[PDB]
Amino acid sequence: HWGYGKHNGPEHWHKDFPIAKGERQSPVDIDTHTAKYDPSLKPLSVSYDQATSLRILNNGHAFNVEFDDSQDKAVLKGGPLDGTYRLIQFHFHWGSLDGQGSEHTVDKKKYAAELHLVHWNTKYGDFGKAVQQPDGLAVLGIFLKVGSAKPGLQKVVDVLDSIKTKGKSADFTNFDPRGLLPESLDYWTYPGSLTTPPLLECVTWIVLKEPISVSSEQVLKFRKLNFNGEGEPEELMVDNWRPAQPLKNRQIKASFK
């Protein structure tokens, strides 16, 4: 089964998921000098005040904080998007060392981690249908650098002990994802894919320019998670990131000058 090891990592994925070598794969390097300001891009609208978090799950690849997406409670609109995209889950990708971990890079710079807030287009009715469409998902990507702690992350950090291993979940209600955002909503955007198998080319990527800061202690706790299930040999959940893929026939647009 696919993963992030030497024998099942990103360089192997194409054998089971041939779209890995497709025309709009993610992540990518964001060359800041080549991205073009697009004045026709509208401000992002992040409407999370009514978000209902439910649960946190270690799925063997990352941990997902899941939300109630049966109504328009936490939605992303505007920017490059047509229509309304409902928040279903967020998760992170991170490194074994502070110098790597992000999936997108910025002028080849790797951040310590990257947060993905995953949303699906309500015109397709459910998430499983949305991933089959070229405009099915909108993923809001936020870089993490190590410095000061992010207070709004701590409730996530402190539950990780209870979901150490693959398949474990815990109740995770009343978590406010607004506490994970940076100050500015300036962003880059481009058409891409899921960054894990099945690698479907269904994502409008919206990557914020401003990183959030998290503390060394916070990221160290991410690195205590396990890829393995309970009672299996311990393999630390680290370096669960796909490297940058060829941009091919795509333009990255900037919301800002």
Ligand X SMILES: CNC(=O)Nc1ccc(S(N)(=O)=O)cc1
Q: What residues are labeled active site?
A: 61
Residues within window 182-241 making contact with Zn ion, judged by CB under 5 A: none
What distance in Å separates the CA atoms of residue 14 and residue 251, rounded to the nearest whole number? 24
Return the range that interacts with ligand X (CB under 6 A); candidates 16-24, 66-74, 190-198, 215-223.
190-198
Site string for ligand X, 97-126 (x = CB under 6 A): -------------------x-x--------
Q: How far is the CB of 250 from Zn ion (least distance, A)?
A: 19
Residues within window 127-156 making contact with ligand X, judged by CB under 6 A: 139
Return the range that interacts with Zn ion (CB under 5 A); candidates 20-28, 77-85, 111-119, 237-245.
111-119
What distance in Å separates the CA atoms of residue 178 and residue 131, rounded to the nearest whole number? 25
How many helical (H) and strand (E) elements, i.e. helices and strands, does the chain have? 3, 15
> What phi-psi label fits residue 182: left (phi over 0), alpha (psi between -120 and 50 degrees) or beta?
beta
Residue 165 counted as an annotated binding residue: no
Residue 162 in tokens: 């209870």
What distance in Å separates the CA atoms of residue 221 and residue 112, rounded to the nearest whole number? 13
Contact residue for ligand X among 53, 121, 165, 195 (CB under 6 A): 195
The answer to whether residue 116 forms part of the interface with Zn ion (CB under 5 A) is yes
Contact by Cβ (8 Å): 56, 181: no
The answer to whether residue 25 forms part of the interface with ligand X (CB under 6 A) is no
Contact by Cβ (8 Å): 47, 216: no
Q: List 46's β-bridge partners, or say none.
A: 76
The answer to whether residue 65 forms part of the interface with ligand X (CB under 6 A) is no
Binding residues: 91, 93, 116, 195-196
Q: Point out which residues bind ligand X (CB under 6 A).
A: 116, 118, 139, 194-196
